[PDB]
């Protein structure tokens, strides 16, 4: 808890991440398995750890699930 994590819900990768990392975001990517969510949901963010509202720190570890 050092910034607060937004809702990832529905953006793409290249727009997941900058987003983190102009938080201050430094830590860890773990990139989870896909998840088939739908051709709307292709590769965009499905699931995220921490969940949106939790404070999460600067080297942290963020887990995203993107869409199959
Ligand atoms: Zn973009
Ligand atoms: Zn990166
Ligand atoms: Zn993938
Ligand atoms: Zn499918
Ligand atoms: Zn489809
Ligand atoms: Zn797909
Ligand atoms: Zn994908």
Same mark, same amino acid.
């Given at each position: 808890?050092?910034?607060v994590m937004?809702? /990832? ?19 860890? /990517? ?9 051709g709307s ?11 949106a509202?939790t404070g ?5 570890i963020?887990?995203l699930?993107?869409?199959?």
């Open positions: 808890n050092q910034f937004p809702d /990832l819900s529905g953006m793409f990768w290249v727009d997941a991440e900058p987003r983190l990392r102009a938080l201050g975001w430094t830590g860890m /990517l773990d990139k989870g398995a896909d998840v088939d969510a739908g949901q292709h590769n965009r963010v499905v699931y995220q750890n921490p969940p509202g999460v720190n600067r080297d942290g963020i887990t699930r993107f869409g199959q």
